[PDB]
Design a binder for this molecule. Sequence first.
Ligand code: ZN
Lengths: 95, 184, 29, 103, 153
Amino acid sequence: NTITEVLKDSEEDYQDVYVCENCGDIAAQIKGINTCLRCSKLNLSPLLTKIDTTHVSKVFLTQMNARGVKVKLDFERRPPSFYKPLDKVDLKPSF
Amino acid sequence: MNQYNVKYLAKILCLKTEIARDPYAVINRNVLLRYTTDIEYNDLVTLITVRHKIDSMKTVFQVFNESSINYTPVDDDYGEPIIITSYLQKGHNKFPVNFLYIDVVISDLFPSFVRLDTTETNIVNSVLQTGDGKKTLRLPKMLETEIVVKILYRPNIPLKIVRFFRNNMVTGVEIADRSVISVA
Amino acid sequence: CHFFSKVPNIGTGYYKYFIDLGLLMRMER
Amino acid sequence: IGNHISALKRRYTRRISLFEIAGIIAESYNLLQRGRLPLVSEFSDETMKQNMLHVIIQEIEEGSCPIVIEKNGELLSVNDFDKDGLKFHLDYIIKIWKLQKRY
Amino acid sequence: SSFVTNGYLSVTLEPHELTLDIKTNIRNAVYKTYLHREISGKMAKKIEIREDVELPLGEIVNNSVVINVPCVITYAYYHVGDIVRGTLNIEDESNVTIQCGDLICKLSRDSGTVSFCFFRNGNAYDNGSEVTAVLMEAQQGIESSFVFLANIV
Ligand SMILES: [Zn+2]
């Protein structure tokens, strides 16, 4: 946790940023509505998801896009989990 | 084949005899203390007789060059010819000249190894599971063409895992395992 | 993990943490 | 023979080290600092005059710590670990915290 | 034109909301993030919180908690060809729309004219008049409402 907090951007500089799960572009906000211009122009309705990353990461990815490399991110949707009682274990030796 | 490398091959054809007698025996230099060998050299066919000291049972191996093979079984034959090849090839009875430049079996670098039985294999497979569903870890790999695999061969027992008893400077001996991967 | 600002799978980060709200929801004002 | 090995490994899962208890305390402390409700017995206005680390330790000891940890494909609460190991690590932690003027 | 399903909705809570008012905060968040919003071409017109099943464990992510709330969802949607009726609304010379209970119909430019507002699609329609339309093409919804390119019936 310590190294994670050291390498991140300051908590006071957070803001809401949305990414398109289809093409990886950062979604624009027009008239208060989040929209992917590229995918909208192609008549698609992809999912937009919030991310919490550094500014330098966004710059690096955008430059890679400028060089022609497309970077697409997926997200984890693990099914819900439930806690169950467990039987007791001692672990001491027999003396 | 020449008059020297046959003497080196005779020692490998004592570990193979031991494995023929018992497929789960531990293989290393010390096995040689239980056998004697007789060699009759010839440029066309070499004859190697392996004899078990306590039982006095004989096994006869016929050794040919790759180019000219003229094999006919004799009394107490191993049942298959031994072939010396120019380059490494698949087959438990084919040995390249590269393996026979030196007396391989008695070198300090020769391993100590064994084949696992069904119970030990089940235990190993159980230990590798991560406990999260059916995910599992994987052992390090070794090629099917190593001399260890050639020595541990049986027609009706596939070989998937090999256990090694490593020399260890602080604990004496350490146990490790490898998985065998095929060669095309 | 560093590139995307995630917690590395090292030390305290080797495990995953959840919160069980069962006891909180069984309390009544 | 596989079931016996599985049972042995499930028992092995219950031992506790510094990393796990430190992570549990860190999560609980972050949540409490940012404003969750403490789950101690006899909760009252006198509870807010205590030290937060005292509250966290009390929650752990009386079995009302809300944090759950996933270790070897299982979900464990702090009280599912071996009791003696938890006492061992908590004693050490409390000593060094007292040296730091935290506890 | 609708169906009913059982499923989980994912929501995010802050630590200061893990108090005695936990159920109220969960309900408010669920309604705020799913009540009248069109997602994947469908809307959820009614959401029921089970209140009779075990709540799953919440996942801690940085400084927040993620919770899967079980619910019964009444999904509603529309397709091409449906006939609807709604109040006309003119804001400028280019933007003319029809507002319905939960649907917005957009009229193409090459359909009528705006003068004064009033609309002339072969008949005189006063700003705020009720008109019938038929959906033709789909788009992305805005401010919790369906959007469809439609022509006046
Ligand atoms: Zn897109």
